[PDB]
């Protein structure tokens, strides 16, 4: 079945959970540090960190005051 | 050509 | 500037200016000429135009009648005086519409939002759908607004959606609003009430069915 | 402009005005003209048009008869005075309901409740069935009690059923409750008011549907 | 003053229109006499009306 | 057999429960509201409330006093 | 230079100016030109490109009346004045969209939302869906609500919709909050905003993306 | 001495210099000129070039209007009067960009830093790919400065890689700056601070993997 | 020839 992304936001003029202008969330981003090392063609390497997203955005209803 | 108009049909 | 809308009833004669040195259209929305006559030696030239459009260039200097026949069985006639100038197009119009197209709703819509839809309509019916069997109702499937008392009525259950229904309530003895929203538990799909009534008094016991996800994940 | 209409029974003769230069066309609402006899050297040039009517040129001075002939069985003549002037239209309406084979199998095949009920549908919707042909309206055909006038405005006809719509105005200053029956006639077979109305008040405009038998009585 | 919420609207879901025909006294095919009645059906079926406004 | 759709009505000048100009009845709405959810192509709905029809109408006599 | 846009509807007729010694060209934006008719002797040569356009040459000095005629079903008169001078581009577009019905096969085999919003995508980014043709933007297509003053930019047209984008600017001194629905006139069926904003500070310049019903009202 | 851009919109007329004794050459960057016109007896002789280009020469004496074609439905109008003197190159430019092509990273990665990179990714997501299975953690994998306690967590192995995570606590009570080169032990591969913090203080506890060698060499 | 054109059709 299709996702249900939002649970119900904290709970002219009608207080709706729902209809609230929605924003994407935030991308995880994490960092790698590799140990130096050499190749093949007997270069070594040093590369430094490499970040990568774990997990893509999802959606969110704003809370409403 | 009395009365006649140029009417070319484009393929 | 604009064509000259003329609509005029069947058999029926209009006169307009036409131009004796320039071409001179007329046009029929929704229908195509078929054939058009007139006086011999008036009207030198006649051409079918894309859709239903006859292009017609006349010489001559005296006024004349000229009939136009479309694909649908209609005859107008016009009555056309030649005059000095530039060409004129006319829209001719049917007078009374013969019949009404009933345009069918092209739309369509998502398919899960209908899946909601006929599960909820075939409970609210009784019947219940093939796929769905009955099991036990769900002790805690709603949140209770304002003093609200629930007791598991009746529930189905199928491969990819389940639900229940549930009786209201009230005890607060105040006059209350209903807002479908209130009802919102995390892991609920739709809420219907089935009495579309917006207020609830004391002892207002609508009924609400609720489908959640079976299988949830 | 409008198409002239005459309403000739088969055994009419119409004194009408012919055009000179520019040709005429009369057409039958309802059948398709097969042929048409002038004296010989009278008529110039003569055509058939794909909806059934047909368009004649006359040439000549002298007043003379004309008989045009359709494809169901039907013949009505025209004596037509050479005039110089526009083209004429004219509308040579039935006045006596053609016989049509064909139909009557239609209308016999089905039931006659049913029969009926189409009809009228058809008289209120607009979609006149296939068999179905436009005839001169009945002059009085329905009873018209204490007060009220008729004024005719169509009428269809098969063959073994016929169709009329009949506006009724109210006279009387006070209003007068109407009911189906008090409008039978003698060969009258279903009455049926169109704004489903209790009671007529006055200076009322309500069209009634009425269908009779096909030459009954 | 602020809000932020979709123009609410209720369904209108306009009735039927229904004609009723009198059917005058008329004998069968296999000989029964039928008395006056009437027959009724509807003209123009029910349907939704669009909403005018959305406030 | 063919449906008898009015009970007779509550019991010039004839008393007929029939030969009654007969009305039709009310068709029933019922409101479903859905639960903001979301799609493949990734969009979030917010559908709103949708109505339909559950029972279609019918023939009704009326009652005469 | 950029080449005049002058928008006649189907019924349109044009003065402009032609020229004598350099050739001259008329485009479609969202057709291709297929037949162009002008009084005989007065075109000395035609042709037809490959985006669709009419490179034609006059050599006459008499003001004349050309038809265009495209492949979609549509027919454009203008009345060229021909003058001594260099050649002129002119952006002959629509004012009533034309008829596609293999566009309408694309638009109802999917969804609804989805196809309002893949409408919209294409909109905001510029990648305009292969049947969707350039039309005349309408001048009063939204509810102004308050002291807003709009503009038209450009507009997309296939069968069963509509797009069109406009300008909005607000007069007020005071920012306004503005919500979707205000702008909601009878006949538009979505209204989404570019930069999403709860409100407008005066001196806005904002554009709103509004599709419509294509002929509907 | 450099070609003159010249970004013209669709449809438009520039008006430019041509030398009537030496070739001139209109090139578009990104398109292919398909088609040249310009009035009869005017341009002598016109070549196609390497790409897109058109190398026209015009022995005429009087300002005349040139259409160029290109290859993706451009059409741009020229007028060139032409002058005595060096030949002259014209680049023409499109206005309004149609289209933006995203282009894809072309880079690739060395394939044993997407090993390492893709294990410690799933380690995190704490799905464990098909090889991989669980083991003992190493009892002392990394080093620990600063008074930092370690104890194992979780650990999988596979054929060529191993994984270890450990916690870390601090009894330092003190400030301290991470540097994921301090924690290096003879042997190790890579080390993933999975909170990104820098500083950690007394009690941070952040979780650190270690992607060793299993089979060391 | 006159009020004629001069196209050439590159391949």
Same mark, same amino acid.
């Given at each position: 079945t299709v996702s249900t992304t939002p649970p119900v936001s904290a709970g002219v003029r009608?207080?709706?959970?729902?209809?609230? *202008?929605?924003?994407?969330?935030?991308?995880q981003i994490a960092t790698v540090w590799i140990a130096p090392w050499v190749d093949?063609?007997?270069? @070594? *390497?040093?590369?430094g960190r490499? +970040? @990568?997203?774990? +997990?893509?955005?999802?959606?969110v209803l704003p809370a409403r005051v | 050509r009395p009365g006649m108009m140029d009417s070319q049909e484009f393929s | 500037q604009s064509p000259a809308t003329i609509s005029l009833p069947q058999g029926g004669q209009f006169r307009l200016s036409i131009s004796n040195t320039d071409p001179n259209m007329i046009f029929i929305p929704g229908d195509k000429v078929t054939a058009i006559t007139a006086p011999g030696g008036m009207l030198a030239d006649k051409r079918l135009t894309r859709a239903g459009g006859v292009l017609?260039?006349?010489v001559a200097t005296r006024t004349f009648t000229i009939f136009v026949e479309?694909?649908?069985?209609?005859?107008?006639?016009?009555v056309a005086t030649p005059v000095k100038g530039e060409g004129r197009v006319y829209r001719l119009?049917?007078?009374?519409?013969?019949? %009404?197209?009933?345009? %069918?709703?092209?739309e369509t819509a998502q398919?899960?939002?209908?899946?909601? /839809?006929?599960? #909820? =309509?075939?409970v609210l019916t009784g019947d219940i759908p093939d796929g769905y069997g009955e099991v036990k109702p769900l002790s805690d499937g /709603? =949140?209770?607004?304002? $003093?609200?008392?629930?007791?598991?009525?009746?529930?189905?259950? $199928?491969?990819?959606? %389940?639900?229940? =229904?549930?009786?209201? %309530? #009230?005890? #607060?003895?105040?006059?209350v609003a209903l807002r479908e929203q209130d009802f919102w538990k995390p892991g609920v799909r739709a809420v219907m009430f089935d009495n579309n009534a917006q207020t609830l008094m004391g002892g207002g016991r609508m009924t609400v069915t609720v489908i959640r996800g079976n299988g949830e994940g």
């Open positions: 009608c207080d709706n959970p729902g209809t609230v *202008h929605p924003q994407r969330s935030r991308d093949s063609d007997n270069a @070594f *390497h040093q590369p490499v +970040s @990568f997203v774990v +997990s893509p955005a999802d959606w | - | 017609f260039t006349s479309t694909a649908r069985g209609q005859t107008f006639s016009v119009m049917s007078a009374e519409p013969p019949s %009404r197209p009933e345009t %069918r709703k092209w398919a899960y939002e209908k899946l909601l /839809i006929s599960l #909820n =309509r075939a /709603i =949140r209770l607004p304002g $003093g609200f008392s629930v007791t598991p009525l009746k529930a189905w259950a $199928g491969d990819q959606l %389940r639900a229940d =229904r549930y009786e209201l %309530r #009230n005890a #607060n003895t105040w006059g």
